[PDB]
Amino acid sequence: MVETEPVQGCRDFPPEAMRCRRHLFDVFHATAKTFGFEEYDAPVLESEELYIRKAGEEITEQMFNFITKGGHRVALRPEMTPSLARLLLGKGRSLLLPAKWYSIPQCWRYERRREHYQWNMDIVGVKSVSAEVELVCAACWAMRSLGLSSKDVGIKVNSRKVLQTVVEQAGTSDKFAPVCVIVDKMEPREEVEAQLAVLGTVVDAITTTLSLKSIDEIAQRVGEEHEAVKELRQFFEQVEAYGYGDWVLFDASVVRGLAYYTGIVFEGFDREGKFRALCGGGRYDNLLTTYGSPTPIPCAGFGFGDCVIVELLQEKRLLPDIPHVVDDVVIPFDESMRPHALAVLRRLRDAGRSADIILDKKKVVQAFNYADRVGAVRAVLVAPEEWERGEVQVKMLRGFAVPLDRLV
Template identity: 50%
Template sequence: MHVITNCSFLIHYRYPSAAAAFLRTLRHPLSLDAPSIFKVKALFTSASYSELDNARAGRSSSLASHPPSSDFTQKIDVNPPKGTRDFPPEEMRMRTWLFQNFREVSQLFGFEEVDFPVLESEALFVRKAGEEIKDQLYCFEDRGNRRVALRPELTPSLARLVLQKGKSVSLPLKWFAIGQCWRYERMTRGRRREHYQWNMDIIGVPNVTAEAELISSIVTFFKRIGITASDVGFKVSSRKVLQEVLRRYSVPDSLFGRVCVTIDKLEKIPMDDIKNELRAAELSEQAVEELLQILTVKSLEELEEKLGSSVEALAELKQLFSLAEKYGYSEWIHFDASIVRGLAYYTGIVFEGFDQERKLRAICGGGRYDRLLSTFGGEDVPACGFGFGDAVIIELLKDRGLLPELSPQVQNVVCALGQDLQVAASLVATRLREKGQTVDLVLENKPLKWAFKRAARVNAQRLIIVGSSEWEKGMVGVKVLSSGEQYDIRIDELE
């Protein structure tokens, strides 16, 4: 048995009066026959007040274990989790450049930026259409016993926000977002488990002028970064084409989403597997063959021959292609009946951006989702939008040799020639920053040669030199690095 050396144990627990008595005994050693209340097990001899407090609150079970030794070290894997990325400065410059182009294009088209939580209710993303997304969720139960998930896409969050706002916002809404998304899936080139996605959505416009505007915005983005129609194209179709085929074979509407999800796997799994999945969805052999035949159609003229001119999907597609002529991007798009997109909520026109050399997965994709809000208990509002991932476009730019040279840039490097001038250099840096100039202040006593190398490394425009003789005159030296010009200038005249 050991005598406790921290009376907080007694105060905090059952014997506050005994603790006071114990304090008095600290002036005098306890005798061997001291009351047993002052004799406690060795377990508590090194327990801190906070540890005992945590134990009472159920926050720790570490009281019975010894703390690790001070020289204990643990080696960790320095790589990020599989499928995720670090963004060191050179990568961050590229990401910033890309996001800036996303934002500027969105603003050119009159869209406002929004964002949503990365963590959402799991129910927001779980739908009953056989979508892969259900098996790709990063989901778990939080401490409040709620099922939550890291968002795999942005559109359901957008729908939730629209429902939340209700009639407090006037339609149409033109919103864009750039957000981090998570999917636990097989990784391929340009496809990671964590990525950023640019979304543009138009809520409240029922006709295809909205889709035409969205495709125009993507084409505008491509042109800004040097991508042409010879690099990228858009496959365009409508889910109403499939609906028409299924209607002719009396396939229930309840199976439509399941059929679309199967058709979206056309280039991913063998054709026999596609047929088996369609048969499992209770399509007749004749319906399966007719559907697969329709999916080979690559022109509106051929589609009209097969389905007739009165089909609603055909009229909408013709209008879209007519608008593409007016916008000036008709060479970028072509009809492809096999494009349906893999998410169950699309209802009309769908489109997908692809790399013309077919080396990469889809670059972007979207379409109309007029009935998404009702799946969350709201009233349906016409809507369409697209998602554009950050990883695939970077791979495409690499292939085309179009990645920009993005070096670090700062306007000024300020260097003190001596430790005693460091305060003076700080003053110069502060004055320049107050005037909106970017400044890299040399924080240590470094030789001038080092400062020149630093200025070159960060692509500085000027090197500001704080020397003792110049400072005594209220001046600093300036070296213009592009021209080599050098001069002294009064501090209050430095711009």
Template identity: 50%
Template sequence: MAAAATLSVVILQPRLTLFATTLRPFSIIRHLSSSSLASDTPRAGRSGSVSAPPVDYKQKKIDVNPPKGTRDFPPEEMRLRNWLFNNFKEVSLLFGFEEVDYPVLETEALYIRKAGEEIRDQLYCFEDRGNRRVALRPELTPSLARLVIQKGKSVPIPIKWFAIGQCWRYERMTRGRRREHYQWNMDIIGVPDVTGEAELISSIVTFFKRIGITAKDVGFKISSRKLSDSNSEFANVSKLVPFLSLQVLQEVLSLYSVPEASFAKACIIIDKMGKIPMEEIKKELQAVELSNEAIEDLLQVLSMKSLTELEEKLGSAGEAVSELKQLFSLAEKFGYSEWIQFDASVVRGLAYYTGIVFEGFDREGKLRAICGGGRYDRLLSTFGGDDIPACGFGFGDAVIVELLKERQLLPELPLEIENVVCSLDPDLQGAAATVATILRGKGQCVDLVLENKPLKWVFKRAARINARRLILVGSAEWQRGMVSVKILSTGEQSEVNVDELE
């Protein structure tokens, strides 16, 4: 028995390591082993922290709730998840995309190459038994980039891939935001034109229409982070704010003769818009030598929701404005103009975006961003590959479910079983199993009653699982090669030859 217990501990070690220990960003987890379980010698992590002593799980009552920020999927929730994922998949296939997947566990370096991103501080990361730094994936795009580089020229361009994968982020939880979630990604690699972004937005609109969401419920905010490579000031702050905001800021700075030293500081403050009260934004801008007139002008322009207004302010010569105009023109051809609007304040948190960016939002303003994406033409070089034009989006499963609840559009997905097969005599259990096997061989779903139950129980069971037919195996009928078939919706009952069951 002692050997068996030891073996059980060894088998469970990876799960104990990952889930029984609180994972904090950039923390090192003590690795359990048969020797370390018996040892009380503390081990220091990379940051000098000391691991907690082993927990005696035999004496500890197990918490029946899942870890904070994660979910169970009992049958009714699993049916909803499958329904949602099937819609993700069917839309992707409609648009000619191929499905891929990646490991949930990736190297930590895959996510920390891009400095200054919030995502770095939200990693579930640790050191494995081989002293390798690894992390649970917080998003899918870096894994996509890694796989594209790995495949190289063996995959013809353009690449159109989609994935539905589990992601992990250690972050503050709000409505629609969990530490564990599933994400639908669609990505196009090798298309430099904004037709790529237009196609992606069209696919999301198609998905919304399939599940009953309209343009009155959801819209897309569109902006751009197109950089001016020749402008060093832009390059220094490009990770902080969208390019359009930079252009506007530069315009205002020039108009009001604000010192150039205030440029980067003002960019950092502008990035806080929507995160802190507007009065705080104004105070911080005043502190970096912007006059009240300059602040009001700047905030007025950044609140623009019209591409025409922006063009009047910045002119139409810039590449960012030109691409935005092309996207809005394509939206008319695709038929989703009413879904999109220009919004100069859209940033997107990930630093790898380089052009058009977009966010799906709840028009009632009750929920956080539903989805988001854009162009990331220079992502591959971050991982040592050759840059290829690329764009894509991520769409989480949590917020859309909250939106469907808000709009009372959650589908009714009851369990539905075609047949219940029951023997009327304990000696006929084998015969009932034969009938079930015949029907299953013909592709029909069968719930076989495995115990000797009274008919009252069987009928209740059939009603609860929404069975279409009840098939009873009785002695007299079975001797003639027959079974009794009852259609539960009408009450019609008849005898049918076993070989003729359909």
């Protein structure tokens, strides 16, 4: 007998589980459309070269890679952002900016779960913090659409520019990304301190700034007109004006684990402190330059996974099982009525209704039970006596003779 379990670390989505996923994805798509983003996609299989960043990232450490028979280094994508950039770089001057692009790719890792889906939202060609404002509002909107409130979740926001200063002022920029990657692990002090020491006083200044509790305190240490300060202030003013001020807050400890973030960074969290980050992202104004773009392309975006949000929605009782539904179930009284019932099935579907016909041979009561089990709104019985009168029998599930034309 074949193994019924899926491959290690991978999920099956039979109809029940698929409905839950579709509930979530419908929100990702609806939110993207509400915010004017355009859908895109790219292959799950990409060249391994795309992810060679040399900053010790967890994402590139845990890569699901292999070699083709042709001897090429490939990987199932651990994230989408490099694929986006490849696509953007491929378009070059032909791409109208600004561009707002989204996708919901399955991404992969190897080490526990080995795959997840991850809603991606990115804004390309916008220098100002309005990009990050929109991105954060979009994540909040998705969560609000799922039934969560600002009492359940928030988005913590910071800028890597603050720390950038401090790293630079201690005397080599090529260690900044590695530094962010390390400092990302902060929530074991002994471990993180030691990691920085391996990378080559400045550790104390890093730790201090991370623990600064407000923007005013940041301004005291970098002036009220440091790059980060004006941008964060503008960011918060704009989110407030959009009406999502209760969802967002400053946290100097947020850097994210990815090498390529240059500016504002953010992550979503549950206000009970029970789950990992709901989503995360930021600005990455240099990535396209590192890929070989002749002109710097400003970019910002986030990823929003399909696992943590579901855990949280389950905890909050916001994922009721919503059963399957169909508008009509057409029941032939017996097999002699099947051709007639097919003609009725056609009419109903032509009118835009979802409809089944009883496919096997079964008695009316068992047909009706079937209708109830599949969540039919209406059972339509096609019987000899009614048919002669140009009618069927209709019965609402959530009896009466009805003429054919009046069914729709």
